[PDB]
Amino acid sequence: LPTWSRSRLSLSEVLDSGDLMKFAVDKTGCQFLEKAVKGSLTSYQKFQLFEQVIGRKDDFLKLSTNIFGNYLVQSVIGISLATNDDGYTKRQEKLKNFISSQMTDMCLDKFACRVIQSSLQNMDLSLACKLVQALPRDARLIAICVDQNANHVIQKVVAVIPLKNWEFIVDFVATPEHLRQICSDKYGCRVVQTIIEKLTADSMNVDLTSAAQNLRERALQRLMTSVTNRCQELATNEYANYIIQHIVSNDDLAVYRECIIEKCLMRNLLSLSQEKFASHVVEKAFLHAPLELLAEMMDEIFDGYIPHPDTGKDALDIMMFHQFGNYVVQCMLTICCDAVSGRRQTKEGGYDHAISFQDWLKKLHSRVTKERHRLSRFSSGKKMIETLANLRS
RNA sequence: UGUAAAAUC
């Protein structure tokens, strides 16, 4: 802090001194400015703030990447946008040019990415769209998606910019090798998740024109083709299993839920049920499958696999006592008890499938009855016994 | 008996 600067200090003093940049990167100095710029500003105070804070590229970049300064930058941007005077256009154009030119570097900065984010939602839409065009289209875009901070720029784009402007991001991410890298990442998955939700024709998109719905659909199909083509890899992955679960769980993605079940899960239920990550996906599939697929799933567990040649152990034996598989059997049982007890719809496709649920329940009850002694050794076993006991009444 | 995210004074 400059020598000449103690409480009861004026904003004009700071602005006139030429020492703003020193205040803005200081904890106490920036604390002062942040409070001062909330008050009533005259035209000239605003003019000076515009010039010193967002007027020259280097100082703007210096403050934007600063732990304290980035807040002041955001406040002054807000004030610039609220001041519809004659210099309005030149200021917003300049701000767009500054960020545009250092896009990647600002995205990857812990503090500057915050400046990018408030600019995206606050700037006039037409100028915010130009910021989006400045996103990199190479390895650097993956870098942004997998960064714990930068990924939020992409999420903000998805939230507040119309799809046409970021369609290149959808196609970039659907590129097989990009999808593999991004979906194998903790933060990269969050980016794909938010895109999927934006691209879903849910109650949140009813404000779209039909042309915009058509655009949304194409982008959805292109992304989902890539997702379903790598479904096996994604369903079993530590991070991307959550995405597959979301797709299977969401009624508004019903057709993709079915694609996944048919071409990924079916015939692999026994093995997937024994995976740490995929076992959760299998549960979701049971919970949300349409009746016809559900019947195939059940039939696969009860009679899809040949029992062990020596011991006579079947798929259901393995699963009941497996560290992860036991949760799938509990899920199967709970579905059946919910159906038979009315807690779950049994009609679907014009028909009441109650008889099928009773069928599957009887099988499970017969198995649990015969194995009650071994099952009572385990928490899962006791849970199933109790589930069945609570049903009788 | 079994997993992620929710990121700045």
Curated annotation (Swiss-Prot):
Changing T311A: Does not affect binding to lst-1. Residues 1-392 form the PUM-HD domain. Changing H308A: Does not affect binding to lst-1. It is found in: Cytoplasm; Cytoplasmic granule. Changing R114A: Reduces RNA binding affinity. Fbf-1 and fbf-2 are >90% identical on both nucleotide and protein sequence level. Experimental approaches often do not distinguish between the two genes, which are collectively referred to as fbf and are considered to be functionally redundant. Interacts (via C-terminus) with gld-3 isoform A in an RNA-independent manner. Interacts with dlc-1, and is required for the localization of fbf-2 to P granules. Interacts (via RNA-binding domain) with lst-1, probably displaces bound auto-inhibitory C-terminal tail and alters its RNA-binding affinity. RNA-binding protein that binds to the consensus sequence 5'-UGUGCCAUA-3' in mRNA 3'-UTRs. Involved in the control of stem cells and sex determination in the C.elegans hermaphrodite germline. May also play a role in the hermaphrodite germline proliferation and oogenesis. By binding to the 3'-UTR, represses phosphatase lip-1 expression in the distal part of the germline mitotic zone. Binds specifically to the regulatory region of fem-3 3'-UTR and mediates the sperm/oocyte switch. Negatively regulates gld-3 expression possibly by directly binding to two sites within the gld-3 isoform b 3'-UTR. This is Fem-3 mRNA-binding factor 2. It comes from Caenorhabditis elegans. The gene is fbf-2.
